[PDB]
Symmetry: D2
Amino acid sequence: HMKIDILDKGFVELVDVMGNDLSAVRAARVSFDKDEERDRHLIEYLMKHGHETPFEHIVFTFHVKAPIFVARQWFRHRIASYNELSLSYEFYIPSPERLEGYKTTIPPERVTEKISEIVDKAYRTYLELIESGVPREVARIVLPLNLYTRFFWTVNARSLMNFLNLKADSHAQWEIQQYALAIARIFKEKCPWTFEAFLKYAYKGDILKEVQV
Amino acid sequence: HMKIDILDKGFVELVDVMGNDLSAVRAARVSFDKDEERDRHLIEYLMKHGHETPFEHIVFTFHVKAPIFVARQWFRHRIASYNELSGRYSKLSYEFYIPSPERLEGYKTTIPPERVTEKISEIVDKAYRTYLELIESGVPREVARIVLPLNLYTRFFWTVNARSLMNFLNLKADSHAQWEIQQYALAIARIFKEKCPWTFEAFLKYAYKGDILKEV
Amino acid sequence: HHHMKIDILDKGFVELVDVMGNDLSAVRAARVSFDMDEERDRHLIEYLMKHGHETPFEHIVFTFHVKAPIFVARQWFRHRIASYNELSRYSKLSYEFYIPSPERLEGYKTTIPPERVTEKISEIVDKAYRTYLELIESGVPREVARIVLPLNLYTRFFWTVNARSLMNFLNLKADSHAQWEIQQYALAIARIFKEKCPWTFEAFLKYAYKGDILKE
Amino acid sequence: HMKIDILDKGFVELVDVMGNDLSAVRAARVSFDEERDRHLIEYLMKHGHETPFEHIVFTFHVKAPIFVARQWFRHRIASYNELSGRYSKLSYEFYIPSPERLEGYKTTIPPERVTEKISEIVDKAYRTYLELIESGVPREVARIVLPLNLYTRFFWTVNARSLMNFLNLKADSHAQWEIQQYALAIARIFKEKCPWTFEAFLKYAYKGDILKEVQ
Ligand SMILES: Cc1cc2nc3c(=O)[nH]c(=O)nc-3n(C[C@H](O)[C@H](O)[C@H](O)COP(=O)(O)OP(=O)(O)OC[C@H]3O[C@@H](n4cnc5c(N)ncnc54)[C@H](O)[C@@H]3O)c2cc1C
Ligand SMILES: Cc1cc2nc3c(=O)[nH]c(=O)nc-3n(C[C@H](O)[C@H](O)[C@H](O)COP(=O)(O)OP(=O)(O)OC[C@H]3O[C@@H](n4cnc5c(N)ncnc54)[C@H](O)[C@@H]3O)c2cc1C
């Protein structure tokens, strides 16, 4: 059902989800059983007064493809579960549009060309080492930080909201902002009430109030 | 739609589950995209080599009604999520765990087992009544209720991934735990086996550290 | 040499057993370096606190020894990003209980005089204890007997907590909406944290602290 | 500060430590004779009562290739502060495996060629990086061309229980040789600060292989 492309070869794909906004309502009340307006008011109430633990009973699993340098920033979120690929070889090459804004001394397209060339040289050294009998765990160290990896991320909505706080923000690196908007979108579609209360009361960042879904 | 009664008025109820044995398999392979023997071999392989992180992608929510002493041993499992009943969003009720006389069997007591049951009962009744008398007096509940005993039943939601569930089972599905938390762990075990049989079967065979799940 | 003890309630306490690092520990983590002028290091602590960059404060760690009634302990133990070891089989067990003083019931217009409330609590507590002792005398195992004991029975535990998690604790428990009893314990924890990490603590009150009682 | 050099440019260094074997013994006893206290450590470890070891805490300063750092940061029950790829100044150094690293494989070019080929490619990527910086390209973008052998630095605060889990998984022959080396350095510092706990860990709860044959 839900897969969003990010960057040149990335994605965020939704694998599974447990619960919805009413999961947090039931957990707060500690009752397994509905009144829309009242249950909506509770979500807002929880979020307004920082009673956030009921949001932990909503869990998501994502399959994410992102460059290693993005993954490293992501994996710093410790309240979450991860399984990473331990195979195929693709790389994020920034478009020229990624480098307009910045005043530079060579054309933005030349930057894209240069990055692409160095990637090609590195990969080729790697394949050459692999063909020589060099084990992969050694041969791969020449590969650049823009090598795509993939991982499964299982994460509850509370910790997901910490992630949005930190990464759906103009101080975060643009690349990771893009992934974060994809995660915000899937989150909004599954837990609309919780996302809305979040934006309203607890969200510390800037982009999700700018840019729809 | 799965509930097990525990002790005289307790229960463990399955509220929700995300995934099944195949969720760990997809995690280990990092593939969203069938061969059944193949998939089991992998579950067994993961278990026996201690690669437990794929099992974190299976998750349960349980609703447990337990006496406070039990809940305190339970809440010590930090890698999980909890919400306890508070009289702030929901109705509170007052029930207490009274051991059956069978519970003292094995122990050579000076007092008959039924008399132990009755003494526990008497104390519950007297504490509960002192409590009520205090509320009626205008003592706030937060103060009044400090006289209630440890066998007062509480309720909570517990959301826990399989890896941490297995840890719980290693520690509480064991003869070394208090008998009351064992019965709760047996119920956990049973719900877990129902929803992830391949995993549970591999857990017993390879990773389970306790004793009682291999007799019941 | 690190060591402080603050008495809380009638028989409770919070004791500092050890501390790793100081304000400069956070400064060093944030820079990934070995610094020890104060002007700049202080600016940086504020900077970090302001912008919600809290990870460096995780590199300051405290160990506490806490004697608190079980009801206070249950709330405390909900803080999962911390390490706990509660008293057991390695030490002698003692039996003391939190009796509130009449003044605790001030402002509450009560049907019986506050001294009577205090006296009622002692009675029912004493009764529960004496029943406990008689069950123990009769051969009832302690894990069964003890379930009659009330929520004001004092326990002891060690708590090892880092400064970021400590600050979260103070945000939740040093607040007029927490139960008074725990507010008192939070005030002792705030006191010890101020003493040992003055810059962080002061930055915390100005930029991040969410409660009301510490700013009095 | 104890400091142990690992690989060509790396290290583990001890920034601070809280407590020692007795910190666990005090935690276990819940209270503020050497044979009795050593014997308690053994007992705890033997019967699975590991929570008292959470009250011994370390902070390390580690300089490691990014590929080692990445395997390391999967240990979530710890606190980490790293140089910023976007902002921090770096030493731009790189791990060049010795030729001896390849001995044990049959390869079709000599191990020294392999070492040299790794150097060349590292060299071209670094120079390309410098031309991009030189050109006005911000570092958060220009750095994506650097290889995974680039050395980074991080602070690591971790309690002894979590540290023992790390040693179970990294001071082990199935782990990549490079992280083994770092694990041995961490095992050395641990052993020095907490001799009783360390001996007990080897004897009752250590699941790896190498710390039992490598002092
Ligand atoms: C106004 C108010 C009313 C409340 N009412 C109730 C109630 O009725 N019942 C009830 O049970 N609790 C209630 N709580 C919550 C209860 O107080 C918490 O269990 C306690 O405050 C622990 O706080 P914590 O989870 O932040 O601390 P810790 O558990 O130490 O967590 C520290 C921080 O780490 C993060 N964290 C740690 N583990 C996880 C995880 N698994 N998933 C996501 N994030 C994680 C969170 O960001 C958290 O803030 C209420 C809280 C407030 C503020
Ligand atoms: C024989 C025996 C006797 C015991 N006696 C006592 C006693 O007297 N007093 C007492 O308080 N406890 C005692 N315990 C331990 C107590 O039972 C545990 O707190 C409880 O069983 C929870 O286990 P856990 O920490 O593994 O689970 P969780 O809290 O869910 O942690 C799960 C796993 O994550 C890791 N972990 C989580 N948080 C941290 C952290 N902050 N630091 C390092 N690692 C972490 C651990 O590897 C742990 O195995 C005893 C246990 C045993 C087996």
